[PDB]
mmCIF file of C-alpha atoms and ligand atoms in Angstrom:
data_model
loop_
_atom_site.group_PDB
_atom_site.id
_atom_site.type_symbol
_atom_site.label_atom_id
_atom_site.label_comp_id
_atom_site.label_asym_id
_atom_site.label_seq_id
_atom_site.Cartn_x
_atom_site.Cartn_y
_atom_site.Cartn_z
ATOM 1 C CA UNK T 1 -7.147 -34.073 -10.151
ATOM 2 C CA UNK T 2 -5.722 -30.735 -8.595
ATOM 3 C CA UNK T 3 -6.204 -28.889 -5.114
ATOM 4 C CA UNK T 4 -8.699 -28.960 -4.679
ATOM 5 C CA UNK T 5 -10.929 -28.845 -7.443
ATOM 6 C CA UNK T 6 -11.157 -31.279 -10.131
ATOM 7 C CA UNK T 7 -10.220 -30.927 -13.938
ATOM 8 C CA UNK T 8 -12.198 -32.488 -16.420
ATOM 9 C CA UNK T 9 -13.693 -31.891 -19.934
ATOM 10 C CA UNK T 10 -10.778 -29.657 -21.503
ATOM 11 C CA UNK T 11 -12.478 -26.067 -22.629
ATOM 12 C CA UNK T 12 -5.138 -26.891 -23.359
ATOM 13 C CA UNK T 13 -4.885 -24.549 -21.201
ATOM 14 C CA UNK T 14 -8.507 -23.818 -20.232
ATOM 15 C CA UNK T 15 -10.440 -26.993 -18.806
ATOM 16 C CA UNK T 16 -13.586 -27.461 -17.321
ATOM 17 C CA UNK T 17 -13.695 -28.211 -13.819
ATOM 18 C CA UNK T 18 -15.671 -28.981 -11.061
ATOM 19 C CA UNK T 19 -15.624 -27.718 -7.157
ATOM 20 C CA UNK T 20 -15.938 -30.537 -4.548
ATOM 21 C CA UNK T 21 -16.900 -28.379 -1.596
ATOM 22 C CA UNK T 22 -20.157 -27.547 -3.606
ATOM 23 C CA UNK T 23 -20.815 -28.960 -7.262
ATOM 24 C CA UNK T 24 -20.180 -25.210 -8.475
ATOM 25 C CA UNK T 25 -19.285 -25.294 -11.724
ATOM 26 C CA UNK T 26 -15.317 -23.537 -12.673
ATOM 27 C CA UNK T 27 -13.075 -22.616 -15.583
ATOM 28 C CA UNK T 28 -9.660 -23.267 -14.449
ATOM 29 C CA UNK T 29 -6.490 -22.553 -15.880
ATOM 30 C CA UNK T 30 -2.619 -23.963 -15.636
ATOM 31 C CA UNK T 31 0.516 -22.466 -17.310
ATOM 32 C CA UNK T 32 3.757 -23.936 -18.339
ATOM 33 C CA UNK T 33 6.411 -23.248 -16.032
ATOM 34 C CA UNK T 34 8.488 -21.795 -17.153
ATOM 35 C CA UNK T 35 8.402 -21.791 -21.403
ATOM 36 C CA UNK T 36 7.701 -19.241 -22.986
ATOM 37 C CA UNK T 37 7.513 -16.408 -20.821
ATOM 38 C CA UNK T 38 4.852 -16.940 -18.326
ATOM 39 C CA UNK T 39 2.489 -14.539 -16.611
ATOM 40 C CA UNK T 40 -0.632 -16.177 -14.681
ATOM 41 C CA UNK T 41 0.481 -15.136 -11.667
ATOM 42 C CA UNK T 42 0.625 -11.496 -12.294
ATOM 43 C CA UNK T 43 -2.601 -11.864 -14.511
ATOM 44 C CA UNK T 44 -4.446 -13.333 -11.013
ATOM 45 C CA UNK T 45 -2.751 -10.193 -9.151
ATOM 46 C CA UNK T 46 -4.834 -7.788 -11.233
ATOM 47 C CA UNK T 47 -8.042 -9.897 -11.208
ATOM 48 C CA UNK T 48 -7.535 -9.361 -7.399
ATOM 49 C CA UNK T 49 -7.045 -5.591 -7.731
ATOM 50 C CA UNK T 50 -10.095 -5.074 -9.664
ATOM 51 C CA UNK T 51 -12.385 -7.353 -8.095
ATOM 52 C CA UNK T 52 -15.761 -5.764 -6.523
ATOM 53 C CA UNK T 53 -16.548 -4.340 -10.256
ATOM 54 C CA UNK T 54 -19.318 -5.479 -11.977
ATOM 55 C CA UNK T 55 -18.374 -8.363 -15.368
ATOM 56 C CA UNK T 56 -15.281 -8.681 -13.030
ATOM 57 C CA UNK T 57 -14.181 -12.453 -13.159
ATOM 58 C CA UNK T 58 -13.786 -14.006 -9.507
ATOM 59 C CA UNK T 59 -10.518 -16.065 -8.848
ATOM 60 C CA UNK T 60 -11.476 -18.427 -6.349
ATOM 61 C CA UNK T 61 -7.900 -19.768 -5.848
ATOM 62 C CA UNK T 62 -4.596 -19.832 -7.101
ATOM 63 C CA UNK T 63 -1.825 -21.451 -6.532
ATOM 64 C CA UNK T 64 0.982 -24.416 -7.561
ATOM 65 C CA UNK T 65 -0.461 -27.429 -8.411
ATOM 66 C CA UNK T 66 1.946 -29.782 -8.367
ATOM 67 C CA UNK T 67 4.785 -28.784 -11.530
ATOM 68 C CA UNK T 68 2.202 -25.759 -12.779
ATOM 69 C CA UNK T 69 0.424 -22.919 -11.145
ATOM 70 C CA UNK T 70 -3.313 -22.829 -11.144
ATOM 71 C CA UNK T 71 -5.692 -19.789 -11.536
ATOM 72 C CA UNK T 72 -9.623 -20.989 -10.816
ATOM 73 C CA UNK T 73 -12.384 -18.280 -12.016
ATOM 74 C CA UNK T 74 -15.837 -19.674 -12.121
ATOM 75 C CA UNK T 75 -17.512 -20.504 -15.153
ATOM 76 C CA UNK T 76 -18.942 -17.164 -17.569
ATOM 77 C CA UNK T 77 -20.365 -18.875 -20.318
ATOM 78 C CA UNK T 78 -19.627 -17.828 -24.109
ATOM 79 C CA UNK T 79 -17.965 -15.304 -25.703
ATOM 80 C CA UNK T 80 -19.109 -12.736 -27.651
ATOM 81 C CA UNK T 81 -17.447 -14.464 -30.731
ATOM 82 C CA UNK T 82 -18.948 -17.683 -30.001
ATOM 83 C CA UNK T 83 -22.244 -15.717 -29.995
ATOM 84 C CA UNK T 84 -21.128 -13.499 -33.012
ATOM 85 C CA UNK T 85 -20.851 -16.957 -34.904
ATOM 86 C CA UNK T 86 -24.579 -18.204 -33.067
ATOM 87 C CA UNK T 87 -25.803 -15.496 -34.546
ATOM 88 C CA UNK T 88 -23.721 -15.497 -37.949
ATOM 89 C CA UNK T 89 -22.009 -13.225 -37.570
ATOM 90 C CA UNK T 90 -23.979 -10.309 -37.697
ATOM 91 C CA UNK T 91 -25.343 -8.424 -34.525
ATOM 92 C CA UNK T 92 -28.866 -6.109 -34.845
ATOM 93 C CA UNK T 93 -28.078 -2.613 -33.971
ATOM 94 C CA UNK T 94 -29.836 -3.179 -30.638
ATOM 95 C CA UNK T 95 -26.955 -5.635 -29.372
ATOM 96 C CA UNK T 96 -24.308 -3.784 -30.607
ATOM 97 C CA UNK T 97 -25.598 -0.490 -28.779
ATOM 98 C CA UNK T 98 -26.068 -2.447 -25.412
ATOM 99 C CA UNK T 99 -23.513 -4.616 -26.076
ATOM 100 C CA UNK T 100 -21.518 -1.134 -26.351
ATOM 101 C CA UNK T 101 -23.157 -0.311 -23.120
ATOM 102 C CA UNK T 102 -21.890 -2.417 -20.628
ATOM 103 C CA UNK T 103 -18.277 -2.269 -22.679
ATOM 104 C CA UNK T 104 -18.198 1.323 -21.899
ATOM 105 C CA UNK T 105 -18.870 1.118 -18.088
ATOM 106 C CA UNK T 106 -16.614 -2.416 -17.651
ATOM 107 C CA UNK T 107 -13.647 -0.818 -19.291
ATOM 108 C CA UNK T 108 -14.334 2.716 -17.633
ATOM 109 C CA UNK T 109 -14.058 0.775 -14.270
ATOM 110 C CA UNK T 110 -10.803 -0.921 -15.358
ATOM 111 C CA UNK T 111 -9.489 2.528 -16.062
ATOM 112 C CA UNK T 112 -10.642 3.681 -13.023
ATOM 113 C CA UNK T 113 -8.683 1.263 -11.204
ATOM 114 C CA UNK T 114 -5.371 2.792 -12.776
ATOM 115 C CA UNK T 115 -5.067 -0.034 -15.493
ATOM 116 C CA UNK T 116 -5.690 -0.464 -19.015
ATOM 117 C CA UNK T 117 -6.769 -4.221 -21.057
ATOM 118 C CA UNK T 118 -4.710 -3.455 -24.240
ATOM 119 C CA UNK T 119 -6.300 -6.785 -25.855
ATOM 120 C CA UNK T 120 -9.792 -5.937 -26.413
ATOM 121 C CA UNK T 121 -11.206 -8.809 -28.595
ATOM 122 C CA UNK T 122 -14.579 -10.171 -28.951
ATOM 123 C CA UNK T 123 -12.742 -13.423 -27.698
ATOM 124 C CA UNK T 124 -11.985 -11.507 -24.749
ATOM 125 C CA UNK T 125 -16.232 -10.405 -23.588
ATOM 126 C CA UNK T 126 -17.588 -13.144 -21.632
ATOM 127 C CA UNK T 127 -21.259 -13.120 -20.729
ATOM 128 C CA UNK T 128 -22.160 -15.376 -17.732
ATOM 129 C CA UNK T 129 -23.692 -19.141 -16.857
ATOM 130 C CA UNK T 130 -26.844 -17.869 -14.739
ATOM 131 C CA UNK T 131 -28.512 -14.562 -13.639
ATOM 132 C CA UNK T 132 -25.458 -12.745 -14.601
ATOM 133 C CA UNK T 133 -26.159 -13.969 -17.528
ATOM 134 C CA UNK T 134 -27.267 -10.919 -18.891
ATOM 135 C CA UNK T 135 -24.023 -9.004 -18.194
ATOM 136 C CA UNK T 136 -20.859 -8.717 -19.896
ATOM 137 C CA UNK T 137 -17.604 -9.563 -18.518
ATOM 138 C CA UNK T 138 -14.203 -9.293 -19.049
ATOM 139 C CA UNK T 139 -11.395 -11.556 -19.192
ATOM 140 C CA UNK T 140 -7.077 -12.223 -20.075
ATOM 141 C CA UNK T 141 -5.174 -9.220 -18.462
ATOM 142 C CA UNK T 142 -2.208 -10.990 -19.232
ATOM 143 C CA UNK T 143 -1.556 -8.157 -21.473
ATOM 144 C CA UNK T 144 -2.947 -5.578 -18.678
ATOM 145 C CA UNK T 145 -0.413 -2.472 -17.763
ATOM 146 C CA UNK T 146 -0.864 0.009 -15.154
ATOM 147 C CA UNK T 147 -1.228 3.567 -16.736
ATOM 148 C CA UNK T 148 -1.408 5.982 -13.931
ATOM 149 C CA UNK T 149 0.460 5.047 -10.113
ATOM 150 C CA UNK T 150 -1.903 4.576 -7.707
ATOM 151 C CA UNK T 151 -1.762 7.293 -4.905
ATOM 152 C CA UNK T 152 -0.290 10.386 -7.317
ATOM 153 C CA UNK T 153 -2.850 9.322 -10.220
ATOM 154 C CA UNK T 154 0.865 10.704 -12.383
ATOM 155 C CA UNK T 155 0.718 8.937 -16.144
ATOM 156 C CA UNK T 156 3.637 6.468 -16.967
ATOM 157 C CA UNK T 157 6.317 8.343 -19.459
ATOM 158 C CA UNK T 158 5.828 8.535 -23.594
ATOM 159 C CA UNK T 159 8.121 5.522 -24.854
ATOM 160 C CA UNK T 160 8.042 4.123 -28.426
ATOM 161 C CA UNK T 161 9.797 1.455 -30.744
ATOM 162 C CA UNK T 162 8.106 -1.320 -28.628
ATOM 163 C CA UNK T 163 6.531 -4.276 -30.462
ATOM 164 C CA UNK T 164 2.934 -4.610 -30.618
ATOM 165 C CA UNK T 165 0.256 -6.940 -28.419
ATOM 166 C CA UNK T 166 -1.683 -9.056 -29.405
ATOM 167 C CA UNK T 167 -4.353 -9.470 -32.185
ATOM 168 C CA UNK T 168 -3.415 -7.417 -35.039
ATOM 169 C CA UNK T 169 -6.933 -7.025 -36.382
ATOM 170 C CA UNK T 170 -8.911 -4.892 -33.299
ATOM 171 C CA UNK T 171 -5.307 -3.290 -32.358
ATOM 172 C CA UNK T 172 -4.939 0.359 -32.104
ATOM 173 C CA UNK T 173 -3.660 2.297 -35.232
ATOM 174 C CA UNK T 174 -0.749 3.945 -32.646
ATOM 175 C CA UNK T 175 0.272 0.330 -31.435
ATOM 176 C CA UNK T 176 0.844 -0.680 -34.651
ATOM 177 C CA UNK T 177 3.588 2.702 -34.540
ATOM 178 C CA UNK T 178 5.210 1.181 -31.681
ATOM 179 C CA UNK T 179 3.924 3.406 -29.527
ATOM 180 C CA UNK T 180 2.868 3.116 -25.903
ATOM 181 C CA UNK T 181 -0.012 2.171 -25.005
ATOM 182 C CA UNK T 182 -2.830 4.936 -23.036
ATOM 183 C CA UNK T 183 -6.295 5.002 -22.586
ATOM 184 C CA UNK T 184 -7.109 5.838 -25.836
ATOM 185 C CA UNK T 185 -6.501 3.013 -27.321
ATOM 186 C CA UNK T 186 -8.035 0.614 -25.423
ATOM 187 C CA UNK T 187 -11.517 2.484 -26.768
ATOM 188 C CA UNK T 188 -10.210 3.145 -30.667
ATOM 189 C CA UNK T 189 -9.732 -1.383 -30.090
ATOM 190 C CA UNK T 190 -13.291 -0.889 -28.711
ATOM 191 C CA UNK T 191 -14.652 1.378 -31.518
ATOM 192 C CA UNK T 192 -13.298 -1.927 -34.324
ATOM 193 C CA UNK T 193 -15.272 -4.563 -32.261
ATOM 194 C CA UNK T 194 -18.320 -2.587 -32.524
ATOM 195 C CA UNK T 195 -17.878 -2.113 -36.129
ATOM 196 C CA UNK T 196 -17.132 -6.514 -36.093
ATOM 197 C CA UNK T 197 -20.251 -6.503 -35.082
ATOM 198 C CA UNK T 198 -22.066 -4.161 -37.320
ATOM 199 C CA UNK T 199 -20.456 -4.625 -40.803
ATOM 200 C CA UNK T 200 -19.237 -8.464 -39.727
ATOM 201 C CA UNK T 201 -16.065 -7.458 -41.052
ATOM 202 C CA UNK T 202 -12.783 -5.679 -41.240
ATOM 203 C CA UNK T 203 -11.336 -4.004 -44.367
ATOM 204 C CA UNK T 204 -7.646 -5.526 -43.017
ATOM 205 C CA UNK T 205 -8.726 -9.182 -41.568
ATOM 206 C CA UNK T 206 -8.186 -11.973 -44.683
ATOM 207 C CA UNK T 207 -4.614 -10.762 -45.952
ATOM 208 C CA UNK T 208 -1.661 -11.821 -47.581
ATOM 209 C CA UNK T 209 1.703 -12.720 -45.739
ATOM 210 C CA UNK T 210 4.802 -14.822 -45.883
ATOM 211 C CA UNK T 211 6.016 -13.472 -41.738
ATOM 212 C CA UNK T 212 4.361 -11.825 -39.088
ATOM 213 C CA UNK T 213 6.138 -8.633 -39.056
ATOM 214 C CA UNK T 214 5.237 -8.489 -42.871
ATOM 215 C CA UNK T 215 1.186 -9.554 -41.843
ATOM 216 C CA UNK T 216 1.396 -6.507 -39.145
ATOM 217 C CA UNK T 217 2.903 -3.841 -41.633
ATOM 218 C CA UNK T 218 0.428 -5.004 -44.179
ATOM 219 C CA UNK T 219 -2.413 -4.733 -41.484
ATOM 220 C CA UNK T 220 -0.767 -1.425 -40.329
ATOM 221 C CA UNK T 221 -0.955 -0.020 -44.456
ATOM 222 C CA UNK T 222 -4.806 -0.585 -44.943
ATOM 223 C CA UNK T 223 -5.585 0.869 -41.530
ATOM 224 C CA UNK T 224 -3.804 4.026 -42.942
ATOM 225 C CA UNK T 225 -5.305 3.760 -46.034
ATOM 226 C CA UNK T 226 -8.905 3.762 -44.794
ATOM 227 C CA UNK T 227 -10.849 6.416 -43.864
ATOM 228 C CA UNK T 228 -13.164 6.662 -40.308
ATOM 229 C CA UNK T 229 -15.984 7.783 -42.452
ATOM 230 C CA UNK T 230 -15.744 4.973 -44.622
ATOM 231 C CA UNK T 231 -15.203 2.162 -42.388
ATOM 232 C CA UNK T 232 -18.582 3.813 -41.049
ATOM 233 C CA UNK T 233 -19.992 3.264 -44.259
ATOM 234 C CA UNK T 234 -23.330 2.373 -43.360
ATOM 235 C CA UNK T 235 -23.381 3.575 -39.902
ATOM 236 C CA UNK T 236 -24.789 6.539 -37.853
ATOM 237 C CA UNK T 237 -23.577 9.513 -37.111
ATOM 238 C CA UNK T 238 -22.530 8.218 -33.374
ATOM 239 C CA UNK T 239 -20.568 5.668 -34.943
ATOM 240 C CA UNK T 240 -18.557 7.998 -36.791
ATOM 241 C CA UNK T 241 -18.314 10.185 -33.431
ATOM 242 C CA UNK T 242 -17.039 7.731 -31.560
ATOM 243 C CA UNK T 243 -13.612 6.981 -33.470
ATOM 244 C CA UNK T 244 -13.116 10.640 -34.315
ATOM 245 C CA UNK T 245 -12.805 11.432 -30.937
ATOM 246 C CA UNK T 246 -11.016 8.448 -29.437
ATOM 247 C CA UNK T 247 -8.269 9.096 -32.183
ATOM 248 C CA UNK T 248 -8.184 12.116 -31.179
ATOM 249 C CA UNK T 249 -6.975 11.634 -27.549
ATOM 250 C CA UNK T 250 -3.372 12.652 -26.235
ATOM 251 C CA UNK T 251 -1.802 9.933 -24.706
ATOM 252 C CA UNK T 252 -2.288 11.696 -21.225
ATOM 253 C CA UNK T 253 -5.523 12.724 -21.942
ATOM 254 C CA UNK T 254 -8.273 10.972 -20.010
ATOM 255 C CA UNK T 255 -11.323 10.028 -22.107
ATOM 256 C CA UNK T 256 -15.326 12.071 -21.525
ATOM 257 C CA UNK T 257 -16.501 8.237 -20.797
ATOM 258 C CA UNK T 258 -20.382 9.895 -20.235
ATOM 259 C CA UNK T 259 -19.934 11.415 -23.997
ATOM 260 C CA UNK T 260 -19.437 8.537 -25.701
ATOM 261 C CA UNK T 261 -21.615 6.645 -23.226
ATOM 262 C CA UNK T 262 -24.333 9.228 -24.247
ATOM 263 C CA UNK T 263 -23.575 9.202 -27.479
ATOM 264 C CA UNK T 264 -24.906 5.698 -28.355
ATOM 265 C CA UNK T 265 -27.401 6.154 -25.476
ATOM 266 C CA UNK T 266 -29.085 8.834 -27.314
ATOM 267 C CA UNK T 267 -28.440 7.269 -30.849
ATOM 268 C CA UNK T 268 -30.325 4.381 -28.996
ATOM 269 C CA UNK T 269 -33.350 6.119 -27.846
ATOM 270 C CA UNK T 270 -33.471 7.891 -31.196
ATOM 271 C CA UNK T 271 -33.699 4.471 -32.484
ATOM 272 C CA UNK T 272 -37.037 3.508 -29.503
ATOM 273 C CA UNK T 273 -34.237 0.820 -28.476
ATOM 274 C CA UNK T 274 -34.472 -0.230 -24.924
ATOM 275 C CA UNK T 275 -32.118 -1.914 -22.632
ATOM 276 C CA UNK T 276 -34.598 -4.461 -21.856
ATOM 277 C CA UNK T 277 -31.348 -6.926 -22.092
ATOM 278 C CA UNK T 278 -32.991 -8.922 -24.871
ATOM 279 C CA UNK T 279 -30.003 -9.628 -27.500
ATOM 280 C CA UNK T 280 -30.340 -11.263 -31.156
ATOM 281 C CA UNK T 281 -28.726 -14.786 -30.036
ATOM 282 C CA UNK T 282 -31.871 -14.611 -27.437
ATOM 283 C CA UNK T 283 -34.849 -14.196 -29.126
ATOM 284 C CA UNK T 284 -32.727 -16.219 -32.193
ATOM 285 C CA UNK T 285 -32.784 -19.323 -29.341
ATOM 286 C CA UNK T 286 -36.275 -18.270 -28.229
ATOM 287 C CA UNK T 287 -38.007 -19.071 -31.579
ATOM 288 C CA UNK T 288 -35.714 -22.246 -32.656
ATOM 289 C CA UNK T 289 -36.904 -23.301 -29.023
ATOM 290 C CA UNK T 290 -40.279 -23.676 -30.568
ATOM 291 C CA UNK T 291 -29.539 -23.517 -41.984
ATOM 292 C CA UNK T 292 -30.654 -21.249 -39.697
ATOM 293 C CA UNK T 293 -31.344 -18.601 -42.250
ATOM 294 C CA UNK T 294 -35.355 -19.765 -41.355
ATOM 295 C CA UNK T 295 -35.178 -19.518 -38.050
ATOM 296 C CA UNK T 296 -33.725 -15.490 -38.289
ATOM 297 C CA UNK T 297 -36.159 -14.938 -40.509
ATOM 298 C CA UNK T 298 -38.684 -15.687 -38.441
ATOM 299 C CA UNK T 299 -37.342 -13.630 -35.524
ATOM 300 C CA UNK T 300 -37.473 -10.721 -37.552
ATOM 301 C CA UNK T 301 -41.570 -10.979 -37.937
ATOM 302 C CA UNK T 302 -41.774 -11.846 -34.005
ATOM 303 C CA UNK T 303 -39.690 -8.952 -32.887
ATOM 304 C CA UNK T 304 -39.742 -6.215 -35.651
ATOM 305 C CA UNK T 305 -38.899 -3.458 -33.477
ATOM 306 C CA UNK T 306 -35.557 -5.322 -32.285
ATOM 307 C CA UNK T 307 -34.329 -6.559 -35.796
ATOM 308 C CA UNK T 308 -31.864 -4.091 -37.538
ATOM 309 C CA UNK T 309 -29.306 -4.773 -40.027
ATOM 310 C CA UNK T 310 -26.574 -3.157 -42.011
ATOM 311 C CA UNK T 311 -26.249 -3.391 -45.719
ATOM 312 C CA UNK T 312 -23.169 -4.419 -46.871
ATOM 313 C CA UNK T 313 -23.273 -2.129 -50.479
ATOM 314 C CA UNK T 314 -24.231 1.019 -48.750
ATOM 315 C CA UNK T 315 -21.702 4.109 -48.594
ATOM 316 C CA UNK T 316 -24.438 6.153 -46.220
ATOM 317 C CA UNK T 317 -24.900 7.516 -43.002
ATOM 318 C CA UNK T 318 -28.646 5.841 -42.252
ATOM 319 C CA UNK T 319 -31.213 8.501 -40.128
ATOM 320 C CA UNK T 320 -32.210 6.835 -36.716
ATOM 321 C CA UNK T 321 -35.958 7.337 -38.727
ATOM 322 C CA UNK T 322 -34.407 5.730 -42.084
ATOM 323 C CA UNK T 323 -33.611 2.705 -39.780
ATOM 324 C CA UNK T 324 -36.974 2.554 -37.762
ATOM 325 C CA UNK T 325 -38.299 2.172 -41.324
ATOM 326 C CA UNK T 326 -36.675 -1.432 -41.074
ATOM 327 C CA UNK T 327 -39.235 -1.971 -38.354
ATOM 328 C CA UNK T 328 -42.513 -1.389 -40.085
ATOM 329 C CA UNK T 329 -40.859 -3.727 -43.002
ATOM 330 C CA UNK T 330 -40.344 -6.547 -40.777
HETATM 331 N N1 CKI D 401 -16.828 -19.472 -24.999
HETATM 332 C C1 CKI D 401 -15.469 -19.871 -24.814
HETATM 333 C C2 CKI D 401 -15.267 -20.331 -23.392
HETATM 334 N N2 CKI D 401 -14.073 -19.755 -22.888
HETATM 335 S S1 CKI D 401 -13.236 -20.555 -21.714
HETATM 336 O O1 CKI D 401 -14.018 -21.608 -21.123
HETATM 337 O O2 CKI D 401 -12.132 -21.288 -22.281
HETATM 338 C C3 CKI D 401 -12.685 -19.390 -20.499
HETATM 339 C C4 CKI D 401 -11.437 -18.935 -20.892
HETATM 340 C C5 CKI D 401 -10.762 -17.996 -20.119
HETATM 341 C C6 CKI D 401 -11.353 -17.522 -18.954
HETATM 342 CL CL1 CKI D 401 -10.403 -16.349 -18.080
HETATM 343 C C7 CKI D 401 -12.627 -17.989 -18.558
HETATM 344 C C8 CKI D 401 -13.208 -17.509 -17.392
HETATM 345 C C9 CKI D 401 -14.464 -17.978 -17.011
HETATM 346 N N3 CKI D 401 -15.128 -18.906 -17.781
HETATM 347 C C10 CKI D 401 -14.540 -19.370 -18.928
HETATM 348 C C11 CKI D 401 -13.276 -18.906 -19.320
#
């Protein structure tokens, strides 16, 4: 049902659906006009604007369907979550550096096109159905603001008091202040997911509340509490580098995007990684082709150079050599 593709397996307000003109496979997506405040308009407005970037979503056509509006964007396969969880939750160093990668350069576009994500969640990195399969993408700018105008390239005003969006747990430390939202802190969001996917875990996620505003503060108190070397606490020194300086942006200040870019670029050939776009769910579905604690295992001795790990005990900052060490064990 719909114009004029049709809706099917539900994947609500995301359902599966299927194109008529061609058998091309699309996610589509209806809102609720008009409770609670929706947005899917305006979030199809900026898909529009920054369309022609690479891991850039294409809306193929929205509209009002009937009582709700419609936004169609083909499909993009899983999340990184979803592939977090494949690979339980735990990423090699490998992914997380490429994984980083393509981050960098998809948000650096968005940037460039005067806006800024301010969600940044692993729910939100989409990786593709085919060929583009390989590549990350980037999805829900419902949240999305404009940070510079357009033609003068002049930053919007300091404002604060405002309440914070959306997920608590890979939100900027300043958000959590009430305070508006730059640059800056769509990278410090980035800087957490990259540590998700190194440690596995956050020291804040898994706490105690009886209301959201009390979850937030008590979110907002161990984020304080903890140290950027120590949430790096088995991490290299890139790691470190990276939240150091992205904390340490003004709120007008544009971000060195080829520093940090180089920074885990270098960290990466330190390392003899490779962007050969091989990731750890890959070669994980590559060998159960032929729990799962066996099958990961197993990977390991295949592709020793690929596999490594963090330890969750260690307080250290591991030598690119210390961790090339975890090769010859494999
Ligand atoms: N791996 C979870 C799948 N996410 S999904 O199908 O609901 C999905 C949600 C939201 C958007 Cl914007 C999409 C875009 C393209 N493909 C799937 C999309």
């Amino acid at each position: 049902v719909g114009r004029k593709f049709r809706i099917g397996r539900k994947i609500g307000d995301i359902y599966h659906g299927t194109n008529l003109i061609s058998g091309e496979e699309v996610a589509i997506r209806l809102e609720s006009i008009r409770s609670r405040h929706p947005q899917l308009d305006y979030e199809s407005r900026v898909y529009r604007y920054l369309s022609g970037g690479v891991g850039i979503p294409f809306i193929r056509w929205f509209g009002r369907e009937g009582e709700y509006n419609a936004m169609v964007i083909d499909l993009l396969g899983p999340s990184l979550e979803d592939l977090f969880n494949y690979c339980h939750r735990r990423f090699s160093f490998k992914t997380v550096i490429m994984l980083a990668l393509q981050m960098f350069c998809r948000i650096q576009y968005i940037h460039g096109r005067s806006f800024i994500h301010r969600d940044i969640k692993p729910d939100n990195f989409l990786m593709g159905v085919g060929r583009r399969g390989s590549t990350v993408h980037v999805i829900d700018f419902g949240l999305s603001k404009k940070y510079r105008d357009f033609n003068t390239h002049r930053h919007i005003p300091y404002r604060e008091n405002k309440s914070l969006t959306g997920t608590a747990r890979y939100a900027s430390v300043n958000t959590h202040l009430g305070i508006e939202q730059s640059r800056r802190d769509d990278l410090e969001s980035l800087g957490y997911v990259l540590i998700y996917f190194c440690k596995g875990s956050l020291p804040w996620q898994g706490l105690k509340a009886t209301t959201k505003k009390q979850k937030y503060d008590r979110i907002m108190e161990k984020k304080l509490n903890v140290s950027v070397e120590t949430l790096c606490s088995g991490l290299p020194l890139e790691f470190q580098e990276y939240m150091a300086y992205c904390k340490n942006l003004k709120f007008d200040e544009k971000p060195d995007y080829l520093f940090l870019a180089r920074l885990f670029k270098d960290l990466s050939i330190k390392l003899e990684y490779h962007n050969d776009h091989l990731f750890d769910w890959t070669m994980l579905r590559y060998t159960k082709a032929m729990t799962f604690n066996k099958i990961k295992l197993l990977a390991m001795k295949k592709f020793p150079t690929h596999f490594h790990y963090y330890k969750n005990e260690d307080k250290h900052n591991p030598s690119p050599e210390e961790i090339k060490q975890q090769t010859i064990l494999n």
